[PDB]
Amino acid sequence: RFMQFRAKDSYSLALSKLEKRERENGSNLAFMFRLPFAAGRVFSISMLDTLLYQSFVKDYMITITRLLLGLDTTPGS
Amino acid sequence: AAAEWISQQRLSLYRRSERQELSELVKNRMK
DSSP states (O other), X not given: OOSSOOSSOHHHHHHHHHHHHHHHXXXXXXXXXSHHHHTTSOOOTHHHHHHHXXXXXXXXXXXXXXXXXXXXXXXXX | OHHHHHHHHXXXXXXXXXXXXXXXXXXXXHO
């Protein structure tokens, strides 16, 4: 929320209420509606932790991510 | 027709093993 902070901005200040409500409903994606994250200005490395934990249920998830990032190059991909 | 040679090298570097990776790393450092 502190990436591009406009303190005199009612819209970005109202996003705090929205994210608190999502955090109330037990959403793991509560930072989602922050404007910098939504625009791609910030990401956190804790997401890769979620990618690893997801791999306990989705063994393909790591491979898919690297294919999108180009980290692993399979001919024909 | 250079793309054919590029594809030939692409499959070769994809099929190459970790022992080849370690060997070339040493040889690159040596030369």
